[PDB]
């Protein structure tokens, strides 16, 4: 098919987003709905989440695929309009295997040195929980604060932190089964575009179908 | 506020909706939105989910409350979007207490006289694993069909049949652990709503503040 494509931006960690080109969990997705459509993708890496929503609100993207949570201050930004979600996620913390009895409940994180990359939920969730917030530019970056010990912990999206740990069991990290929130993956579309719609009822019939279930068995299962 | 009051499509069953006039965790959803804005409501029962929604696509509504399950088929309906989900449910079965070690997984639903109600996801479920499917014109038809031995079980919205159960002890029913699916429950606008991007914020601000759970606390915790 000749049609103009789609401009995508991409941004996330995995499993949901890996950098070559891209893939993962989110990949997966929308290259079905793409599909299901015959449409044409052209992938443009974003920097964070609220230039990538911006991207979009600008008519600079059609659409920001990625483990996007749905929050209360993305859906309140102007020219754009979440999908209907695909995944259910949740935030939660990555620790030493020794600060386990620590870290029981949400309650546990005030006043501790917990790392937290920037433009991400967890920001506010830490500040929320009164914990000493580090910020660090990437996950990589919070890592190395805990692999180093300038931080106790690490608050990020529980299946990120999850297949880190799964990539390096050397390093006898844990992931708490503390669950800071629990939070909704969908994809940003210019609000009132023509396309919400046909994009809608894929991600639904891929969702109900179980193959999206069969995408995050793929890199998690 | 003097302001044209909204026109606010009913449907539903207990929890989510109770016709006296209208309340129920549906309710107690929509007017918490509504209350966050000085809105003005006219409230009006509708006959089925489809009718409902129909009537928003043709503009004699403003908007559809109650369990409305997000499908793929109702967001394919033109002149429609749902909202953000505010709950996720499940599809369950109602059976007497002694059928308990037929219905152990959906593989065992395929031949067993199964009641559903016209009109819901159950009828699609019930169909797709090869039930014999009994349909009836509400839920207290479908159970009264239970009551008596016209069917071995009743498939309908998991936290409808719990409610049920623990209005009626006496009758010794129970609901398997069975979960025929997961379906979000979302409210439907007319597509394009100048209303949209307000109601998706302030559900997604009581879905994050936990006021939601508080409300669903209230009817079944």
Known sequence: GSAMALKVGVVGNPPFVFYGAFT?????????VAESQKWNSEYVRQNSISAGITAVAEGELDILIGPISVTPERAAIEGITFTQPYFSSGIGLLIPGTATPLF???????????????????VDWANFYQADVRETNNLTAAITLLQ??????????????????????????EVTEIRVSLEPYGFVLKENSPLQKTINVEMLNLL??????????????
């Open 24 to 32: 993962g969990i989110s990949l997966d997705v929308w290259r079905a």
């Open 104 to 122: 029981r409940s949400v309650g546990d994180l005030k006043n501790k040195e917990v790392a937290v990359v920037r433009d991400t939920t967890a």
């Open 148 to 173: 180093k010990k300038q931080v106790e912990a690490v608050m990020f999206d529980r299946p990120a932190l999850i297949y880190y740990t799964r990539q390096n069991p050397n390093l006898n990290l």
């Open 208 to 221: 109900y179908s179980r193959v999206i279930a069969e995408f995050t068995e793929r890199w998690l299962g």
